Amino acid sequence: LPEVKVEGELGGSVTIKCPLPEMHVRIYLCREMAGSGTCGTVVSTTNFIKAEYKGRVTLKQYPRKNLFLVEVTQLTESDSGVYACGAGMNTDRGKTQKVTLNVHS
Amino acid sequence: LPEVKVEGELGGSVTIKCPLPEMHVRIYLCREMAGSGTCGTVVSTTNFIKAEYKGRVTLKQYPRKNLFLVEVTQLTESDSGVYACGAGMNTDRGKTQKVTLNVHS
Amino acid sequence: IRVFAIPPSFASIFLTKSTKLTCLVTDLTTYDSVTISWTRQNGEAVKTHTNISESHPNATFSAVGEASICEDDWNSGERFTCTVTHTDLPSPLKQTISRPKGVALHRPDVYLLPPAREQLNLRESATITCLVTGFSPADVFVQWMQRGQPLSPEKYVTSAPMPEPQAPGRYFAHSILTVSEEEWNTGETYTCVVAHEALPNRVTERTVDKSTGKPTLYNVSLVM
Amino acid sequence: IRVFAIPPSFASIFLTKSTKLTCLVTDLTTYDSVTISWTRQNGEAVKTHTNISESHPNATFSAVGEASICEDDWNSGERFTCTVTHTDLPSPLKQTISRPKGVALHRPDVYLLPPAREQLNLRESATITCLVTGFSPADVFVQWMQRGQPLSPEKYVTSAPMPEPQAPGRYFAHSILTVSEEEWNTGETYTCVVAHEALPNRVTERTVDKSTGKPTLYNVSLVM
Amino acid sequence: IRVFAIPPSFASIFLTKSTKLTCLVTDLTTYDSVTISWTRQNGEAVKTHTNISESHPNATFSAVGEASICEDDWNSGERFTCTVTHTDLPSPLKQTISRPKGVALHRPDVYLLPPAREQLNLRESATITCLVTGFSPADVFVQWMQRGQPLSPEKYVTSAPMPEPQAPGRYFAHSILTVSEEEWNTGETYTCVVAHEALPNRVTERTVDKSTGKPTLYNVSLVM
Amino acid sequence: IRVFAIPPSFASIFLTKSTKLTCLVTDLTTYDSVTISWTRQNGEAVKTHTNISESHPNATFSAVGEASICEDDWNSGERFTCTVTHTDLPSPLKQTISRPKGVALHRPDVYLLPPAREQLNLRESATITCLVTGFSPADVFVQWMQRGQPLSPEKYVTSAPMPEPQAPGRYFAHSILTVSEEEWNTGETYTCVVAHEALPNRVTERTVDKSTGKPTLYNVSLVM
Ligand SMILES: *[C@@H]1O[C@H](CO)[C@@H](O[C@@H]2O[C@H](CO)[C@@H](O)[C@H](O)[C@H]2NC(C)=O)[C@H](O)[C@H]1NC(C)=O
Ligand SMILES: *[C@@H]1O[C@H](CO)[C@@H](O[C@@H]2O[C@H](CO)[C@@H](O)[C@H](O)[C@H]2NC(C)=O)[C@H](O)[C@H]1NC(C)=O
Ligand SMILES: *[C@@H]1O[C@H](CO)[C@@H](O)[C@H](O)[C@H]1NC(C)=O
Ligand SMILES: *[C@@H]1O[C@H](CO)[C@@H](O)[C@H](O)[C@H]1NC(C)=O
């Protein structure tokens, strides 16, 4: 439901803020492909970093303010879409929060 | 197509005569269950003797007259139906010859 | 001159509900007048072993010692050592046995697979696969249940945990149950149950039947 | 003089994995420096009895004695004895508690029911019902797990095992989890795990979702 | 004092198109001045070995000797013996190596399985199973091909031939290929190829894609 | 004086698995007690040349020399030499044959086509066509296998590799198997296995059945 509408610059890094829920172990930052109604997991607690994002992203969880932060290092035109974050085994039936990304260059 | 209409007696044994074809390795004596249009393999060259027929049947192949003979020892009311014999991986798409069996007691 | 022990495994613990400490002697010529006892870190001794084994026919001797104790101490990591006394050795040998205390824990994921279509054409048999992936450590127990009653272990095969290439530390295993094409086409739901320490109740069940992937909302039938 | 001994319950054993027994001393004045200890059949000793219950302001005394043991000893037929000494009652007090041997064992049957359509029409709340029937004896532990994580114990209510009306010796129980309708309509899956000491693995799981039980509507039959 | 050899395997023969005779020394202290040669039943010697190995760090020595010869003689059953000369031993040791001549031959049956539906919901990965059953002896080779080009052997796992319970003498093996849910949902046909001596050309290929079990005559789509 | 040496062909090698080469001596009178032998580059000897061809009644002489070798020696670049001695030509004769090195290698593309509808309407016979195109060099072996058992070699006809019209250096070939229509209409499956020395496993299989290629007719779209 909520949209951070996070913004950033080409290069550098940008931090995505998403809520960390309880009674849900798998936490993911899925990317809304919006092609054939399918969303592909970019990162997860089960340890799966997409090949296109390998070595550029990380996921750190700390239940201090009930928040988990995901950082994306570097930036490319490809990195300018929707990255719905959520929990649960089914990736398409989670997406608790929706966010948008772009590039300023 | 051909029907031996083989006949026998309760107890003893009866021999089923079926043609032994070439260029076909799997040779079976399927039983036409005729329930939901499905035939269950009673014996095969791949070595599968149904539990109800375990230790009572045998299959010997010898290309002398292009014939393989199958013997059924003992006899029960259950042993009084159709046993289509054929070749090939698909059991329902073979059944080269059809035969009938009964009991005289 | 070695004495090798067999610590209780999680599979044995879940199969028998009885953790047992056992040790065997090897590389020793067959003899007699040997007593085996089990001791603990605290120092006190435990119950007496029974069921003396025999002599290996390769010029080696082996003695077995059983000791039943609470699994909590084995998990806690108590140090258990069995003492064996022989004639050739002047000082009895000590064999300390403890569980590795501290392992990353990950619950296994189970996946049941229905027999292939080309297999259900010989009308002879069918093979169902229960596939377990993503679990550490390598102590897993799998068994098959039909109609709420366990099947005999002489009709399915289970493999040993093979490490996962993608995730290091995680393992995977496979279990195959051979049934009849008849039985499978006559309903008969089959269940594979997996027991692992990281599981909440150490139990997980899944079932598959002939009709599992159907939409169950419509029913299309092509008839000619 | 009234001293209560509470044998461990299977529900508590399964809930805590830390089987415990309590020797509760009541019907006495609030006197300090009391001596309470647990002993076995042969007169051995047990661990320290920490966490002594506080005295009550209504002129009653409360004391608890805890003996850490493992389940096989308790369920093997061994009998325990509680020792209580006091200034008011200098005579030693002994109490014996153990398993009540001599009862048949039967496995429960679990049926999970979806919420009523009329309740759903209110578009407010929904209640899933778990019906456990036919189990003997009366020691069943029911729990609800949404996605592998147990829901707060204050969310559901479980009933005491009342005797089955037509079946003598067997019992039945209920369990109601109240969830928000919105969650139920989004495909959220709920399951009712029930633990009994007569089940094969002493665990059983039945699940339910909005699509469970819905019948087929379309029967398309295209003919050439 | 042993010298263990490694006869060429059918997997190695089919992988490299070069049968090789190799033998290693063991249980010998590290030394030098050792020459290894390969001899045959006929009596004449063969090509000279190269690539001297090193000394094992466990107080043992090993020498490797390579000899490339026609596979026909190895199949025919020619007796090949490698002769090693050392200082401690006065007489050189002889190690005869031959193929077991006479084994029941049975062609393997292959079955490819598509990933489970519950696995294609995390949108992360998928595992495809190639299942080989009914083959004697236990020399089988499996590899995966995508789009006519073989994949790297570091993304699939193959097991060792485990004996079949039903048919004695027959064996079975399993190979799993881990792909992406994306790739699988974007066509991409996958092929598992099996090489066995009982096979007519010693090659067998099967493919599965996302759309394999469809009727391909009608197409029903429920839209709301 | 005309003596012909025939280097082994890949088709014959794959067909017989017994690679052989022939030194044919012609243009001579029918004289007996001839001496023919095959020798290597360095002048070694080979096995006996049995099965000498019979003399022809048209005043011509025929002799064949067979040298049993293994494929790696022939394809490694080693050159062979034939020795022919006769009373008419006492001078020794030498001939050199080997692989023609210096040619690019490309893999063929196989397309299998079903019989024409008009041919099927005759309700008499049907012809399946296999089109192998784009392969270089010209050494392709085509075979037909119905159910894993090769059909009689006299049932099908294969064409010599004619140069591809638009692609220089590449070639194409045809193969026609004539089957009875009744068999084709019962779902009998036919495949076209083609062997070339540029394919990954040097083997490739394409199959065809009555249902292969047929399009979808019904597109049901039920809406609520
Ligand atoms: C039969 O109809 C279905 C539903 O319209 C088709 O499925 C679509 O296929 C296209 C690609 O061809 C995808 O872009 C869509 O996402 C699919 N739909 C869904 C709901 O996933 C299917 O392709 C049709 N069959 C054929 C042979 O065309
Ligand atoms: C949907 O229709 C099909 C076709 O009529 C049903 O399949 C039959 O099921 C019965 C048992 O219920 C079998 O005796 C028949 O052999 C099946 N038909 C075929 C062609 O195999 C199917 O049962 C129907 N679905 C439901 C839920 O009843
Ligand atoms: C569904 O359709 C099949 C095929 O036409 C038919 O046999 C069956 O009776 C139908 N179901 C009902 C409930 O009529
Ligand atoms: C088949 O039906 C689907 C769903 O209604 C539709 O999208 C598609 O266009 C149809 N195919 C053709 C060829 O019209």
Author numbering:
A (entry chain A), B (entry chain B): 20 to 124
C (entry chain E), D (entry chain F), E (entry chain D), F (entry chain C): 345 to 568
Paper text:
Two binding sites (position 1f and 3f) which have highest occupancies of FcμR, reached high-resolution (3.5 Å and 3.1 Å) in the cryo-EM maps, thus allowing the atomic model interpretation of the FcμR Ig-like domain and the IgM binding interface. Due to the quasi six-fold symmetry within the Cμ4 domains in IgM pentamer, the FcμR molecules at position 1f and 3f share almost identical interactions with the two Cμ4 domains (Cμ4-A and Cμ4-B) in subunits Fcμ1 and Fcμ3 respectively. CDR2 of FcμR forms additional interactions including Lys69, which form a hydrogen bond with Glu526 on Cμ4-B chain and Asn66, which contacts neighbouring Cμ4-A chain (Gln510 and Arg514). In addition to the common features, different interactions between FcμR and binding sites at subunits Fcμ1 and Fcμ3 result from the asymmetrical structure of IgM pentamer. At position 3f, Arg112 in FcμR interacts with two carbonyl groups (Thr530 and Gly531) on the Cμ4-2B domain in the neighbouring IgM subunit, which is presumably shared by all the FcμR bound at internal subunits (subunits Fcμ2-4). Furthermore, additional contact from the carbohydrate chain extending from Asn563 on the tailpiece towards the FcμR is observed at subunit Fcμ3. This is due to the mismatch between the quasi six-fold symmetrical FcμR binding sites and the two-fold symmetrical IgM tailpiece where Asn563 is located, resulting in different relative positions between the glycosylation sites and FcμR molecules at different subunits.
In this study, we image a complex of the ectodomain of human FcμR and the IgM-Fc pentameric core using single-particle cryogenic electron microscopy (cryo-EM). The analysis reveals multiple binding sites for the N-terminal Ig domain of FcμR on the Cμ4 domain dimers within the IgM constant region and provides a framework for understanding FcμR’s role in immunoglobulin recognition and signalling. A key common feature of the FcμR binding sites is that only the Cμ4 domains are involved in the interactions.
